[PDB]
Amino acid sequence: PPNAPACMERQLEAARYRSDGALLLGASSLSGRCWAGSLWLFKDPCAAPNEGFCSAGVQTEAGVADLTWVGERGILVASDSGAVELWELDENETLIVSKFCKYEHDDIVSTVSVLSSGTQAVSGSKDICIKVWDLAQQVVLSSYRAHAAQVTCVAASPHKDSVFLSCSEDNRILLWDTRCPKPASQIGCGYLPTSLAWHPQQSEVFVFGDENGTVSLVDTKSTSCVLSSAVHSQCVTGLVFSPHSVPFLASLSEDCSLAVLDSSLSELFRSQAHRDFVRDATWSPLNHSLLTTVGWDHQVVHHVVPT
Amino acid sequence: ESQTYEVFEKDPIKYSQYQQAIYKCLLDRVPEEEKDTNVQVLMVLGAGRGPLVNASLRAAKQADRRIKLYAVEKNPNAVVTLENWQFEEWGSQVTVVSSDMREWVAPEKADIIVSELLGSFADNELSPECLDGAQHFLKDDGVSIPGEYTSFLAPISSSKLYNEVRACREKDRDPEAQFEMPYVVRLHNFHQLSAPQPCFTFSHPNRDPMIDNNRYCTLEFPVEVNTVLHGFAGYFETVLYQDITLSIRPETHSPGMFSWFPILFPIKQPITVREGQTICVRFWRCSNSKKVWYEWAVTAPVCSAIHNPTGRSYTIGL
Amino acid sequence: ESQTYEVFEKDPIKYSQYQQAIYKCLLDRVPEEEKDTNVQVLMVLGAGRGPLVNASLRAAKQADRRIKLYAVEKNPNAVVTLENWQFEEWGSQVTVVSSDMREWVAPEKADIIVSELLGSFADNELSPECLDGAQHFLKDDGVSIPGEYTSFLAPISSSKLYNEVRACREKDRDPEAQFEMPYVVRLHNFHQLSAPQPCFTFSHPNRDPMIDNNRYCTLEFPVEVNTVLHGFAGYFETVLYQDITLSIRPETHSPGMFSWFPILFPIKQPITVREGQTICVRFWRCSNSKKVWYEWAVTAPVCSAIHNPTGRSYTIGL
Amino acid sequence: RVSSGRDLNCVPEIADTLGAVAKQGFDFLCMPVFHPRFKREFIQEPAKNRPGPQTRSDLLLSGRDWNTLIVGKLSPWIRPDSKVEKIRRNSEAAMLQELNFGAYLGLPAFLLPLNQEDNTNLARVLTNHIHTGHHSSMFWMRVPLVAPEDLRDDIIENAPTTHTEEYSGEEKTWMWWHNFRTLCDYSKRIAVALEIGADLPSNHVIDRWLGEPIKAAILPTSIFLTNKKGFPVLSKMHQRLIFRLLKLEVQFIITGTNHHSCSYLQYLEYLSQNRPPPNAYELFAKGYEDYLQSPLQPLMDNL
Ligand SMILES: Nc1ncnc2c1ccn2[C@@H]1O[C@H]([C@H](O)c2ccc(Cl)c(F)c2)[C@@H](O)[C@H]1O
Numbered sequence A: 001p002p003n004a005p006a007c008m009e010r011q012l013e014a015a016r017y018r019s020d021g022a023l024l025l026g027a028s029s030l031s032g033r034c035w036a037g038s039l040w041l042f043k044d045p046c047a048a049p050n051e052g053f054c055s056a057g058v059q060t061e062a063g064v065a066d067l068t069w070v071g072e073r074g075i076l077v078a079s080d081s082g083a084v085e086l087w088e089l090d091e092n093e094t095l096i097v098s099k100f101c102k103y104e105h106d107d108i109v110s111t112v113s114v115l116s117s118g119t120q121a122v123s124g125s126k127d128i129c130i131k132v133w134d135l136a137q138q139v140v141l142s143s144y145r146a147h148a149a150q151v152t153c154v155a156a157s158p159h160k161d162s163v164f165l166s167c168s169e170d171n172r173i174l175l176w177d178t179r180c181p182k183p184a185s186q187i188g189c190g191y192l193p194t195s196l197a198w199h200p201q202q203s204e205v206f207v208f209g210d211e212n213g214t215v216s217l218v219d220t221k222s223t224s225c226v227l228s229s230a231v232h233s234q235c236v237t238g239l240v241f242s243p244h245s246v247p248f249l250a251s252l253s254e255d256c257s258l259a260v261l262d263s264s265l266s267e268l269f270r271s272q273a274h275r276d277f278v279r280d281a282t283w284s285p286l287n288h289s290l291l292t293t294v295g296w297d298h299q300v301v302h303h304v305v306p307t
Numbered sequence B, C: 001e002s003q004t005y006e007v008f009e010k011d012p013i014k015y016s017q018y019q020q021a022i023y024k025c026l027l028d029r030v031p032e033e034e035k036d037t038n039v040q041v042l043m044v045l046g047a048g049r050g051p052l053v054n055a056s057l058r059a060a061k062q063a064d065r066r067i068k069l070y071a072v073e074k075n076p077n078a079v080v081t082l083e084n085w086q087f088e089e090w091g092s093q094v095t096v097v098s099s100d101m102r103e104w105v106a107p108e109k110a111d112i113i114v115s116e117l118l119g120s121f122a123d124n125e126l127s128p129e130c131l132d133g134a135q136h137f138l139k140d141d142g143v144s145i146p147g148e149y150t151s152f153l154a155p156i157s158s159s160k161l162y163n164e165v166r167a168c169r170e171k172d173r174d175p176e177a178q179f180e181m182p183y184v185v186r187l188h189n190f191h192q193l194s195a196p197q198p199c200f201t202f203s204h205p206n207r208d209p210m211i212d213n214n215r216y217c218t219l220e221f222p223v224e225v226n227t228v229l230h231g232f233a234g235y236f237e238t239v240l241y242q243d244i245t246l247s248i249r250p251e252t253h254s255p256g257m258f259s260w261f262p263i264l265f266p267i268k269q270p271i272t273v274r275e276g277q278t279i280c281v282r283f284w285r286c287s288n289s290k291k292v293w294y295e296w297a298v299t300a301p302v303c304s305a306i307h308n309p310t311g312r313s314y315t316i317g318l
Numbered sequence D: 001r002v003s004s005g006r007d008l009n010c011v012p013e014i015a016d017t018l019g020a021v022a023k024q025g026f027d028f029l030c031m032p033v034f035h036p037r038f039k040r041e042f043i044q045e046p047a048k049n050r051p052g053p054q055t056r057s058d059l060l061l062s063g064r065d066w067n068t069l070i071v072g073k074l075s076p077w078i079r080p081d082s083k084v085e086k087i088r089r090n091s092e093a094a095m096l097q098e099l100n101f102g103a104y105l106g107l108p109a110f111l112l113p114l115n116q117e118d119n120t121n122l123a124r125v126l127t128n129h130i131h132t133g134h135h136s137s138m139f140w141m142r143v144p145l146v147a148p149e150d151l152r153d154d155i156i157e158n159a160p161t162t163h164t165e166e167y168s169g170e171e172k173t174w175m176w177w178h179n180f181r182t183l184c185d186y187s188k189r190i191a192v193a194l195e196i197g198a199d200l201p202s203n204h205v206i207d208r209w210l211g212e213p214i215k216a217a218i219l220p221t222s223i224f225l226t227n228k229k230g231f232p233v234l235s236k237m238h239q240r241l242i243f244r245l246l247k248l249e250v251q252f253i254i255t256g257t258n259h260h261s262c263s264y265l266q267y268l269e270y271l272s273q274n275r276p277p278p279n280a281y282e283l284f285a286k287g288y289e290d291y292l293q294s295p296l297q298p299l300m301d302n303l
């Protein structure tokens, strides 16, 4: 517990394992006198969620809605204040210093995703816009009003620094490519798109989950012949692929369960560990059969995925 | 509403009287040589925003004893204030239970159940019905605070309040419905024709099986003057614990207790009463599996229609 | 009333259809080689003056099997007719239970529960609520007769029935209350603007937890003519057992079944509908711990007010 | 001179936020009564059994401050007309809960969104809240002059914006309000909060909000053009709409994040002070506006 707050707020929003095996935690209080958020680092993945056994810790003036790793030092933050924030670690990695706080979105930034190169990042917000940023220049390069309803999920291409997915409450899943004068392109196929995951190997295949707990497998090449399975009974909140040469798909949900599926989208693992909303899944860079799920119940459960 | 709780909380006397009632009960149940061996299971029923829960902590501080607190509350908006109280200050001592007291399955039985489920006519807020459904989770030797309440009625004349009542007629309902329902009112311009007499009484806990909260009372009010009766003022009196009491009966009124104002039971037609005559009134506490209500008639010197038959004009919901 | 039961008993088709439904169920549950080893626990729920109980004896005679009968009934006046039936003719085979089916603690579970708790709009008499509260005393593999019912609605024009409804206004209530409540009526002079479509469906027994009998349906009625819509006619269809069914839907109407007439759901203001247009209606089955009722609105071609919000003008009592 | 309020979906400390808002110069604050992202469950375990408080406590402000300075807001995740049965049932229970909490606090107004065409279940649940209990809280439907789908940038390649002048389609947000308030039986407790977009629509569209109960006008930061001295100002046509709205005595509401060095408030105040003078008829009738009176009958009666 360095020069950090003495209490991390009950609702854990995001779990992100970096290269060496350290655990990043973003969390916010969605109830009580204070509705602010905070950032935490855990060099010991088994010390989480203990607020007094952390490597580094910090407090944000507003809640934490989404986060990503900007390499190994920085952390990109999507906040309710309508601001995107980059927080880079100090020399000994014992402090989390806020580099920039840019209020550009007119409402709660719901999603953030760092662009393949590591120099840019795209954010999606409740203001219905999608913004492309320069992490070094402290500014927004482009502002896009492509959607009709609030933006739910933004997912940058694994390698192309101009390609990314987008999905919103207007039933639109847009494939982007800032290399065109009309960047967005409606990818067809029903229920509202809620989560997006690019495939790590086939940079032409991606998956998306809907508000009816169904996970679908889609190809950029053809907007037909889609493979699907009803994984959960409630809204698919997240999708993360394993580090394996042949990855595994982890799907978290509002039905308070974790699911692990293969290529044919069949269930290999199911976890009722959580008593509240399952908000994340992060595979250990070291033990690839390890999966860490943070929820809203303050639990950080580590699952040994039966591979 | 939030402001309604606030108003009913700004009565120091009422809560200090409850503090003292818990205080005397603590000493009576836990002897000095058991001050740390025994922990009293205290259950506030209908906890509001936590005022009885607070006075319960103040009573356990002055009596110097250990208490396991519970705060059963059905209104979920007050339950927000309760959980915000429990986290910020009370701690694990108080266990908030967001439930109706008649549904709640308790972990264990209680040493004392404490309630503020009374109104101006004592049983009019439906305190009998509620504590009865909670009685199963009271120890075979437990205390209920309050342990007893009694309603009082007195006949009044006030052609001013009679007019105020007529003025309450509304479209799309019985043109006389305003006279078949009680009103809480600070009776000001009026004349009390006879001294208040007791009406209905409820005791808690109620050991008696086939317990039945239905009632029928017949009162005879002797009037020494000539007048025109317009209705009956209702008042209440209650025993929290032993000599610790709260009252609104003007003769035994607890001094400086703003909270509960008197009730007014109208009568459709005013009645001439000569000197020496007796005003005889009948009251009935009625109920079905869904509602509770009163019916009432004046039988002397002259008869009136029975007011609010079958709760047609006015019911209290269960 | 005694004469009401009489009227609803003078429908031979209805009871012969129930006889056949029990008959096929007897054979399906008791094989020929078990004809005397097994005795089926039959429970008629809402037994009236005993017509289903009688058809149950006729079904056990044609199917040639042993049955333990029960006749649960809440109306104590019909229960007099039941006990007078049981003594004089039925004997110890039938066990009359003078209780609400939702209170009754049964000696054992039942092989088949049989009910007539349906009305013209199927679930309007409150059959879902009643059989749900009885489901605990049904065997983990038991049959419920009827096993399913579905309500149908169809939009109608009839400036005659529209007038009949306006004529129902009463003093001391909402001047428009007569349009926010259904009526059972033998629809005669009228025009059906579109074919009946299904609305609400209930299945028994209902295995599903968080079962919830609340509903919301959205129907689109295609109208091929120009007209003025005045309301929606309601009809029902039910499956007692397998292919044995009862219906009032004019297209699938069970022939010669006088008993249940259609319902009429009015609309405060009439609506002009051009040829080719679609009449879109929303219905809601609503409820609280005390009442059940419908709310409804026309959303196309033009909107109406939502009718009977919060059951303000009309409720069915639980 | 103008009655103005600040809208935000981020309030970490209510006393700090309200304090800062008033410090800026705002007469009131539109803020969420529950946390915008706090999705709740009411049917299935275990998120149904979520423990601890559900929002902050009423004690954090005086009753007087809740009655006069706080406008509630529906949580954006609540969708009573969702095509998903599970989401409808949950959003019904959640909407009743949120509305009942606003009523418990004694708030003077509560905001609800009108952003799609089908608002039937939303209206049924509002109507029911109106008939359940004694509360008198006003309801402001947040409806935009132009649908968000009709102001989206022409950037989707395989879905281009239909540039054709569609006379009736240009006024689809009016029909959304119309059907909603028809459903609600023209309740005098349901009024409009008109969001004014960046590009003002056709004049005929703005002529549909005439005769409608506009209680408030929502001006987002995004619509303010910058002047030579780096300050936010408005176009001559947006200024005309504000002048029209000032006669209707609406409450101006400022929404969105900051984009200038309150300055937005100062502009509205300036327009208010620099308005054309109301003639003797506009000064005499000031008070008698839309007040129904009985025509005098001096032959029958004595004046
Ligand atoms: N059967 C039940 N189960 C659980 N709680 C129940 C009931 C019936 C009523 N109550 C609650 O008792 C409180 C009491 O009336 C009260 C307390 C304090 C003030 Cl100041 C006040 F005005 C009123 C209210 O808060 C009611 O919600």
Ligand SMILES: Nc1ncnc2c1ccn2[C@@H]1O[C@H]([C@H](O)c2ccc(Cl)c(F)c2)[C@@H](O)[C@H]1O
Binding pocket: C004, C005, C006, C007, C008, C009, C045, C046, C047, C048, C049, C072, C073, C074, C075, C078, C099, C100, C101, C102, C116, C117, C118, C125, C130
């Ligand atoms: N929950 C309950 N528990 C016990 N009985 C219940 C209920 C609810 C209703 N009923 C009875 O069902 C009968 C049925 O509706 C019926 C039968 C025959 C004819 Cl002809 C007829 F018109 C009507 C009535 O006799 C009702 O009294």
